[PDB]
Design an enzyme around this catalytic site. Sequence first.
Site, PDB file in Angstrom:
ATOM      1  N   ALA A 266     -13.234 -18.868  -7.807  1.00  0.00           N
ATOM      2  CA  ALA A 266     -13.955 -17.613  -8.028  1.00  0.00           C
ATOM      3  C   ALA A 266     -13.086 -16.608  -8.761  1.00  0.00           C
ATOM      4  O   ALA A 266     -11.920 -16.873  -9.041  1.00  0.00           O
ATOM      5  CB  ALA A 266     -14.423 -17.025  -6.720  1.00  0.00           C
ATOM      6  N   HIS A 301     -10.539 -13.978  -0.244  1.00  0.00           N
ATOM      7  CA  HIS A 301      -9.573 -13.805  -1.323  1.00  0.00           C
ATOM      8  C   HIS A 301     -10.057 -12.810  -2.398  1.00  0.00           C
ATOM      9  O   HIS A 301      -9.358 -11.850  -2.740  1.00  0.00           O
ATOM     10  CB  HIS A 301      -9.272 -15.165  -1.966  1.00  0.00           C
ATOM     11  N   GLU A 302     -11.255 -13.021  -2.932  1.00  0.00           N
ATOM     12  CA  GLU A 302     -11.732 -12.104  -3.966  1.00  0.00           C
ATOM     13  C   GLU A 302     -11.938 -10.684  -3.415  1.00  0.00           C
ATOM     14  O   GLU A 302     -11.739  -9.706  -4.138  1.00  0.00           O
ATOM     15  CB  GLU A 302     -13.030 -12.610  -4.607  1.00  0.00           C
ATOM     16  N   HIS A 305      -8.557  -8.821  -3.239  1.00  0.00           N
ATOM     17  CA  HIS A 305      -8.137  -8.362  -4.563  1.00  0.00           C
ATOM     18  C   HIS A 305      -8.544  -6.910  -4.848  1.00  0.00           C
ATOM     19  O   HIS A 305      -7.937  -6.253  -5.702  1.00  0.00           O
ATOM     20  CB  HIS A 305      -8.728  -9.253  -5.656  1.00  0.00           C
ATOM     21  N   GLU A 324      -1.519 -12.411  -6.990  1.00  0.00           N
ATOM     22  CA  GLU A 324      -2.024 -13.661  -6.439  1.00  0.00           C
ATOM     23  C   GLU A 324      -1.286 -14.101  -5.178  1.00  0.00           C
ATOM     24  O   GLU A 324      -1.929 -14.457  -4.199  1.00  0.00           O
ATOM     25  CB  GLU A 324      -1.987 -14.783  -7.477  1.00  0.00           C
TER      26      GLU A 324
HETATM   27  C1  LIG Z   1      -8.760 -20.656  -4.808  1.00  0.00           C
HETATM   28  C2  LIG Z   1      -8.421 -19.198  -5.070  1.00  0.00           C
HETATM   29  C3  LIG Z   1      -9.369 -18.279  -4.321  1.00  0.00           C
HETATM   30  C4  LIG Z   1      -7.017 -18.931  -4.569  1.00  0.00           C
HETATM   31  O1  LIG Z   1      -8.379 -18.920  -6.460  1.00  0.00           O
HETATM   32  C5  LIG Z   1      -9.486 -19.115  -7.311  1.00  0.00           C
HETATM   33  O2  LIG Z   1     -10.572 -19.446  -6.846  1.00  0.00           O
HETATM   34  N1  LIG Z   1      -9.473 -18.431  -8.476  1.00  0.00           N
HETATM   35  C6  LIG Z   1      -8.253 -17.861  -8.969  1.00  0.00           C
HETATM   36  C7  LIG Z   1      -8.105 -16.484  -8.375  1.00  0.00           C
HETATM   37  O3  LIG Z   1      -6.984 -16.025  -8.179  1.00  0.00           O
HETATM   38  N2  LIG Z   1      -9.200 -15.808  -8.008  1.00  0.00           N
HETATM   39  O4  LIG Z   1      -9.063 -14.482  -7.407  1.00  0.00           O
HETATM   40  C8  LIG Z   1      -8.332 -17.899 -10.474  1.00  0.00           C
HETATM   41  C9  LIG Z   1      -7.496 -18.775 -11.155  1.00  0.00           C
HETATM   42  C10 LIG Z   1      -7.565 -18.865 -12.538  1.00  0.00           C
HETATM   43  C11 LIG Z   1      -8.477 -18.080 -13.215  1.00  0.00           C
HETATM   44  C12 LIG Z   1      -8.570 -18.236 -14.701  1.00  0.00           C
HETATM   45  C13 LIG Z   1      -7.463 -18.165 -15.521  1.00  0.00           C
HETATM   46  C14 LIG Z   1      -7.635 -18.360 -16.887  1.00  0.00           C
HETATM   47  C15 LIG Z   1      -8.893 -18.638 -17.408  1.00  0.00           C
HETATM   48  C16 LIG Z   1     -10.000 -18.728 -16.575  1.00  0.00           C
HETATM   49  C17 LIG Z   1      -9.834 -18.532 -15.215  1.00  0.00           C
HETATM   50  C18 LIG Z   1      -9.330 -17.213 -12.542  1.00  0.00           C
HETATM   51  C19 LIG Z   1      -9.256 -17.121 -11.155  1.00  0.00           C
HETATM   52 ZN   LIG Z   2      -6.817 -14.320  -6.942  1.00  0.00          ZN
END
Ligand SMILES: CC(C)(C)OC(=O)N[C@H](C(=O)NO)c1ccc(-c2ccccc2)cc1
Ligand SMILES: [Zn+2]
Length: 889
Positions: A266, A301-302, A305, A324
């Site tokens: 996400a 998590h989101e 943030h 992160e």
């Molecule tokens: C599982 C957990 C919740 C830890 O992480 C995730 O699901 N998502 C991450 C994240 O940190 N979300 O907050 C995340 C990671 C990479 C991207 C990205 C980066 C470049 C392009 C396109 C996408 C985007 C998001």
């Molecule tokens: Zn994140």
Amino acid sequence: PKIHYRKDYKPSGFIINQVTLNINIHDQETIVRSVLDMDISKHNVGEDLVFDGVGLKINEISINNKKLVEGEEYTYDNEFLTIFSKFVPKSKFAFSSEVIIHPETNYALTGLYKSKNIIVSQCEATGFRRITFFIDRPDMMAKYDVTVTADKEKYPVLLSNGDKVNEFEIPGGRHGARFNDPPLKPCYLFAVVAGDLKHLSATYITKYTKKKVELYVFSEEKYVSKLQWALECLKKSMAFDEDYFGLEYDLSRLNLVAVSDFNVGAMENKGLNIFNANSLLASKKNSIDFSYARILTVVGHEYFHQYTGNRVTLRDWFQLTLKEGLTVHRENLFSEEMTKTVTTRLSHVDLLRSVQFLEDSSPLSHPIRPESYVSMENFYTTTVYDKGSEVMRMYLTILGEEYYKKGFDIYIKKNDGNTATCEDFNYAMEQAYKMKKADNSANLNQYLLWFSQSGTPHVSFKYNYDAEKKQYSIHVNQYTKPDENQKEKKPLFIPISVGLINPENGKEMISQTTLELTKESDTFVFNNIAVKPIPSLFRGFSAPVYIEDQLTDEERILLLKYDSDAFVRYNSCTNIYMKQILMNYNEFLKAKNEKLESFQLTPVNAQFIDAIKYLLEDPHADAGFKSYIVSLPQDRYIINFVSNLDTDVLADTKEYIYKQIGDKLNDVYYKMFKSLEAKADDLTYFNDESHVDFDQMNMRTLRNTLLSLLSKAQYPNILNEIIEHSKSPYPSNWLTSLSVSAYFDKYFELYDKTYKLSKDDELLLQEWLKTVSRSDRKDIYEILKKLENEVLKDSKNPNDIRAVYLPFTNNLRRFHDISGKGYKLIAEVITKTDKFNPMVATQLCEPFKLWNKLDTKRQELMLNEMNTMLQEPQISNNLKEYLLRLTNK
Ligand SMILES: CC(C)(C)OC(=O)N[C@H](C(=O)NO)c1ccc(-c2ccccc2)cc1
Ligand SMILES: [Zn+2]
Ligand SMILES: [Mg+2]
Ligand SMILES: [Mg+2]
């Protein structure tokens, strides 16, 4: 290929104050009009105005409503728009542009793209430049005014950041919505969504200011019944940030949106969080148990943030672990508190010591704050996230809960609304450290090495006890192996949470104690220790290190049975297993190398087996914990301890050890499988989507773990249990019945039965694909081909592709077939995927990460496939950069 260096950070010569967007979605194309209200910064030196802009088709660009002309006043090379400085105003000015982009054919899922019938954006890290021209970097903070228009029938729900301040009809069956978002944000937090979305909603009242927050969770109409748990998780998240950190949500609305095509779990776009459907949607009928912790984690998590990433942002991408690592740490605190199971923390450690330790001993090894990058899309690593979270967690271990909360609030108060760096956080923690140690001389300067130094530290122990003196000594040593990032490794600040167990009664002999190891070695002495203790070291896994406890198996068994700390018990079990594995591995290896006609194997320690039985038969012991003790350590954990690992010999080693324990405990396993049924498969709340019982899910995990062990063993009449299991309402159970039936003639009947149960739910079908992929079948290559022809086909959905191939790559005997056919297969998939989605193609490279740790024949086979992939003329920047680093080229 441009390399970006952390040391090279310099502020922009420009400022972007206001973004005004018109995004006009049409059938064959999307037109994006943008006005940027800009200014000259104090750092400006008369340079050209250079915007990022990737794959944009220019209709027109202007400065102050005067059309610019290509060649004379600007150049565009499909990557950078350069306006020559002589045409750049010296004071406040407006830049405007109209570009055409094409979400429908954007299969890379970055920028603006179509997922099924939903238009959605993904801008982190450098995706906003695929939508319109911008100085696409997170220190460029601006205000956003966004209008979206679209066919009303196809796209009735329109969303973006901020408040919806207007809605209007448009001739030709179209409609528009305008969103104004006054607070400054970086462009990577911009988002837009358009689609025929259905929703669940609720109102949350904040704890202190009593503000009403509207919560909305969205999906396509087909799956709207799978939204309930997500909404519950969001409410849980908000309450926890309030209760633990004293932090309230500051906006009037929060939207969560599920889409089918997404590169990761996400994304935390402000007020508009966008999710892989597999990390937002669940129902008890259509989801396996793992989905519930996954949604809790990702929603949490989101949400977290919103402070650590959104309100306090990043100066530059090298600071990624600051948002992160910290947000993963916050999500871990949250999930541990919500689940109330020790397996939550254990699962994170298990992942760190397998996957992240492997990365950290690979050619890809980097510190949590790297010194350089070529591809931002390859930057989002388990090192940055998971070792990052352990580094963030160590502050809590060092400071204690009260002073940690004080430091964290200092960080938030001082940096709220601004960009920050890792040093800012360390500074905040240091203030709390001074307070705790009661002297302004104390500092955390050495702690910064956790951000800059790569590799996993090794921490080893020696002990001394003087019975007459009642004096106990723990001698501790740390060492980090030199690598490509530091020729000389410095000692770290390592906090070692310790207990001392009385071996006669199992009781604690000292109060809670955290040793602060700050030198290459130290001796910690304890007085008035009445009897020789067994040390309980790195409780809670208090630092991300290789632990060498130098304990006997007798001492480890005593900790496993009687220690108070779940991680130390689990680790003691792990260490007993590793000693056995290394021993038997070398015995099988010798027999193979010397072509022996006969040889001996050292049996599994009988007292260890007795201890496993003791714990399994304890009605008050935890089911989740029990499932860990009957499972051998992960292959990717084991490989950290063996040079030139022969995977076939390891497979034979694991087989021997599992059969040794099963020969003694199978009747116990069976008795438990049966006695656990009533509570594990209780259907009382099967139709209540808000009732989630993590202990009950752990009971099912234990049952399904035992069923697997019994099935492999061909336990008498176990096929009857398997068939009955296939009839369970719980997908975790009936998918388990498929994989354990691999060892029987009924496999393809359960294959068909479970396919029929799975095929009409997109996410369930993907879980079915994984189950088939990880099935222990001798004909697994034929089965994969069947999946390709009948189910996967030419799907570009990353969830589909990852489901079919990644679980198979963990098949130790089959993926690592000595012919190299498994390596050939995944390399073909990577090359095929790289044509449309480089980010996911690079994810699919994961099995190659250990290539140089295998036996020499398999190293050669893997290296050949990677060199073959590197020679593809159309290889993406992502994949090329990654394979070059991995192959040490
Ligand atoms: C599982 C957990 C919740 C830890 O992480 C995730 O699901 N998502 C991450 C994240 O940190 N979300 O907050 C995340 C990671 C990479 C991207 C990205 C980066 C470049 C392009 C396109 C996408 C985007 C998001
Ligand atoms: Zn994140
Ligand atoms: Mg284009
Ligand atoms: Mg699909």
